[PDB]
Paper text:
Here, we report the atomic structures of an engineered diffocin, a contractile syringe-like molecular machine that kills the Gram-positive bacterium Clostridioides difficile. Captured in one pre-contraction and two post-contraction states, each structure fashions six proteins in the bacteria-targeting baseplate, two proteins in the energy-storing trunk, and a collar linking the sheath with the membrane-penetrating tube. Specific attachment of baseplate tail fibers to receptors on the surface of a target bacterial cell triggers conformational changes of the neighboring baseplate, which leads to reorientation of sheath proteins and contraction of the entire sheath assembly. Since the sheath and the tube are anchored together at the opposite end by the collar, collapsing the sheath pushes the tube through the baseplate, driving it to puncture the cell wall and underlying cytoplasmic membrane.
CryoEM data processing of the post-contraction diffocin particles resolved two different substates, an apparent transitional state and a final state, which is 2 nm shorter in length. Using the same strategy, we determined the cryoEM structures of the collar, trunk, and baseplate in the transitional and final states at 3.6–6.1 Å resolution. The baseplate wedges in the transitional and final states are almost identical, with both presenting a post-contraction conformation. These movements result in an expansion of the iris ring from 24 to 26 nm, with the ring structure remaining intact. Although the conformational change in the diffocin baseplate wedge is less dramatic than in R-type pyocin, where the iris ring breaks apart after contraction, it is still sufficient to initiate the contraction and release the bound hydrolase domain of the hub-hydrolase. The observation that sheath layers on the baseplate side are fully contracted, while those on the collar side are partially contracted, supports the wave-like propagation model from the baseplate to the collar, and our structure of the diffocin in the transitional state provides atomic resolution details of a intermediate of potential relevance to other Gram-positive CISs. After contraction to the transitional state, the tube protrudes 45 nm away from the baseplate. We did not observe the density of the hydrolase domains at the spike-proximal tube region in the post-contraction state due to the limited number of particles.
Author numbering:
A (entry chain d): 16 to 135
B (entry chain Y): 1 to 78
C (entry chain C): 6 to 353
D (entry chain e), E (entry chain Z): 1 to 70
F (entry chain a): 153 to 353
G (entry chain P): 153 to 253
The structure:
């Protein structure tokens, strides 16, 4: 019966997702709003598996490291990792849906395409 | 040192490290406080606590050294 | 060793445009002396004067929407016109207004605007207080002793307000008969004089429909030539023509100059892209849905005659297939929607 | 008591103690410091619970009993 | 010493131990989290002081009183 | 390993034993060792450089101690060797297929089988069947072709001096090979990824 | 360029490197220069005159400093030379074909 309240804008420090070091503005932690904090949250969730660290909550983290190393066949592991990423990302209430398109199998490199739908 | 070990891979830089190091130093201070208090729990290890030990004994006097405090406590009981 | 994963989201841009909803105003102050782009509402530099702040507040609200962008530059009154011209050349502007425009400054502004529109092809519009100039790019709002919210207002103040109102006006909507709730007190002024003033090519305010609104949305251009005509009398049409011109110029500059080779198939792809952009415009109600684009065949013939190659003994299609010497000749059909302010019908 | 005090409970308590524009999120760097401090504080709570019993005359160890009887 | 350390002194000490070019601004979420962690710190120090009190039973009758009397 | 000092040779023997028990469809990279508990500290950049030197090392990753790469000790892979030959996983299956083909040929065809066109066709069928067996496994690609080495047949003719003109190229295959066999085959061993890198929208 | 005075030869080297980085599909005409911050003010008529001379100069176009032309330094073109020979892009592929042949 009650109508759900919109999630307030998430704020956090900012960094280049390649630098991986929080860039700081004139001695003040940078402001990220609307479509900036969710990307940082997704990056944090994907980069580190939770079960490696006891401090993090059990539902947090991703389980893609099991497939890391070429343990099984690429064709099946594509479908498996799609569901793995969907489970690892759908935990955030901000994220609406996850869509994975395909995977590129070449030498010792995998390239894939995934999609995210959000609220703002 | 423990927190940074528990910290994730992307948080391995100094910007993250400073707060964790300061808090670890603070918690080292806290744990040595725990050690001091546990010493205070035992009458033999408690030095400054011997005064209200004697107060529990309901005998009061200015005292020089903690060894004499412990000796007087042992003499008082039994 | 360890190779890592990095993924960054990307969203395709839709309808990238330029010089849209831009308000340029330069004020003479001895305190700020600089340009200030206004992106957030109620952004007031402390250096600005109270009257300048009132100008900004007038520019703030729009009729239907807040104007997309307002840009303010400050410099001393001396040599103000030259520096304003230089700054407006530096950065594109959709509209221009001057708090303290003297007649000579207004004339210089109109000359600069028409010079850009004719030589530089920079389709821009300016708002002027009292100018009878012979160009449609300028706007002449001749309404003296304007009082808005029981407050005295100079002509330039309300011209700036009207420019801000226009910037917030959607193209599918109208500028005519726009009631102003802020304006409460206006001098009495007869209907016949209103008709005469409108037929003079001027913009005025009237009290109609239980409110204070304008009477017509025509250009300041009093004399529309045969090629300009009635549809060029309206600012609403020149606005969309300028928008389409600027968009086509921008996309051509981005894509085809130098980067794209000159070939028949390249020309066909360019025609397809232009047709797609025209379809995008046709989705909007600004123009008609029927349009055609063609290669300028007569220009091809002229290029051949300049080259001296005989036009006989080959198919006309070979002329299109012929090399154009790093040049392109095209033709296109357009028809901008023109519609009615007030109506007149019949009954039985 | 200290059994009630756990890393999750004191973590939520500390999060409430902070009035900040940053929305509380799992895995946040600030949340990382808060969680680490809360974990160590819960360990310290357990130590306090233990030294409850160790300070008593009963349930002593060989060295504890030796000190008491001496 | 549990009573030696108080809320604001250790708060300022923790703030000083932070050695960054980031200016320490009052009312910042960083200052707010330092405040919350120091709140929990004051709680644990006060509880340690209460533990010492309960061990000596100078007031607040306890089971410790009964056992020591026994 | 297990709070015990180990010489380099001891752990190389341990790693060889680990490799022997490694299935081919599985991997050698990032294999965590539960027995190893204590390792000297060594920076990530140093690990990357050492791996790029063609070496095999241990790193502490994913809450465990594992290796970083499964490349060969060969530092300099030539143009014909390349990236797919940098990996021991691929040279292993190449060696296995080579040994199996040599073994079956020695068992069946040398001396015992006559040299004929139909004998060559049956040998090609058998080799194709063995390649299908390998294709059933994920070690190699499922697409492969086997052919008679036509250019070697031409070379044999030129050695014999018989003119190549005025007969069909099929007659060259039907021609006697002087107790010799010339063949051609297409292979492609599956090469796959250790860690990934994708894109999001 | 980048808030710094540069010698003419410095920018000729920069442009030569840019052209070496330019594929044969594209033409160097109307190429924006982000690094360059300012150029001396000059009339567009003089720019067209220099284009007729064949000299290559920068130009401030669309609010950006850009290359006016890819015309060759060849000032005098015979009757049979043609306009395409005035273009470095056109002669470039001819030179490439000559070298390959």
């Amino acid at each position: 019966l009650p109508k759900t309240e919109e999630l307030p804008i998430f704020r956090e420090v900012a960094w280049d997702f390649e630098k991986d070091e929080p860039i700081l503005e004139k001695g003040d932690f940078k402001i990220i709003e609307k479509k900036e904090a969710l990307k940082v949250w997704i990056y944090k969730c994907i980069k580190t598996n939770r079960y490696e660290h006891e401090i993090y909550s059990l539902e947090y983290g991703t389980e893609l490291s099991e497939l890391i190393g070429q343990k099984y066949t690429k064709g099946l592991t594509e479908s498996e990792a799609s569901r793995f990423i969907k489970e690892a990302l759908l935990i955030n209430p901000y994220i609406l849906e996850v869509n994975v398109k395909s995977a590129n199998f070449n030498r010792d490199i995998l390239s894939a395409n995934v999609k995210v739908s959000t609220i703002y | 040192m423990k927190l940074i070990d528990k910290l994730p891979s992307f948080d391995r830089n100094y910007i993250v490290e400073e707060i964790q190091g300061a808090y670890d130093t603070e918690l080292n201070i806290l744990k040595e406080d725990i050690d001091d208090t546990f010493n205070q729990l035992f009458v033999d290890t408690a030095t400054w606590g011997l005064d209200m030990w004697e107060d529990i004994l309901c005998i009061e006097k200015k005292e020089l050294d903690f060894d004499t405090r412990r000796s007087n406590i042992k003499a008082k009981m039994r | 060793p360890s190779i890592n994963i990095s993924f960054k989201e990307l969203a395709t841009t839709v309808k990238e445009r330029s010089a849209r909803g831009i308000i340029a105003m330069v004020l003479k102050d001895a305190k700020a002396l600089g340009l200030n782009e206004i992106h957030e509402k109620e952004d007031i530099p402390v250096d600005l004067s109270a009257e300048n702040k009132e100008y900004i507040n007038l520019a703030l609200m729009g009729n239907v929407n807040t104007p997309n962008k307002l840009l303010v530059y400050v410099i001393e009154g001396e040599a103000d016109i030259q520096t304003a011209l230089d700054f407006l050349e530096t950065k594109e502007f959709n509209y221009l207004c001057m708090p303290k425009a003297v007649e000579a400054d207004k004339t210089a502004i109109k000359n600069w605007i028409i010079k850009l529109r004719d030589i530089d092809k920079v389709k821009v519009k300016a708002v002027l207080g009292k100018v009878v100039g012979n160009h449609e790019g300028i706007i002449n709002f001749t309404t003296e002793d304007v009082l808005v919210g029981e407050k005295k207002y100079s002509v330039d103040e309300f011209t700036s307000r009207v420019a801000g109102l226009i910037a917030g006006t959607p193209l599918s909507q109208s500028v005519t008969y726009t009631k102003l709730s802020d304006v409460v007190d206006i001098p009495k002024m007869t209907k016949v004089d209103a008709e005469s003033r409108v037929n003079k090519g001027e913009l005025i305010l009237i009290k109609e429909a239980g409110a204070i609104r304008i009477a017509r949305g025509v250009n300041s251009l009093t004399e529309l030539t045969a090629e300009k005509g009635e549809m060029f009398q309206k600012i609403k049409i020149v606005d969309t023509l300028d928008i389409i011109h600027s968009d086509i110029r921008k996309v051509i500059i981005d894509d085809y100059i130098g980067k794209v080779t000159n070939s028949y198939d390249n020309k066909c792809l360019l025609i397809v892209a232009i047709k797609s952009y025209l379809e995008e415009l046709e989705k909007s109600a600004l123009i008609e849905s029927d349009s055609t684009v063609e290669i300028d065949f007569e220009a091809q013939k002229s290029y051949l005659k300049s080259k001296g190659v005989d036009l006989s003994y080959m198919t006309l299609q070979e002329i299109k297939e012929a090399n154009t010497g790093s040049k392109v000749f095209l033709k296109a059909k357009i028809k901008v929607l023109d519609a009615m302010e007030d109506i007149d019908l019949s009954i039985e | 008591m200290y059994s009630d005090q756990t890393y999750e409970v004191i973590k939520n308590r500390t999060l409430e103690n902070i009035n900040l524009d940053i929305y509380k999120g799992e895995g946040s760097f600030l949340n990382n410091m808060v969680s680490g401090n809360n974990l160590e504080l819960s360990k310290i709570y357990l130590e306090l619970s233990k030294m409850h019993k160790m300070a008593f005359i009963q349930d002593t160890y060989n060295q504890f009993l030796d000190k008491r009887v001496n």
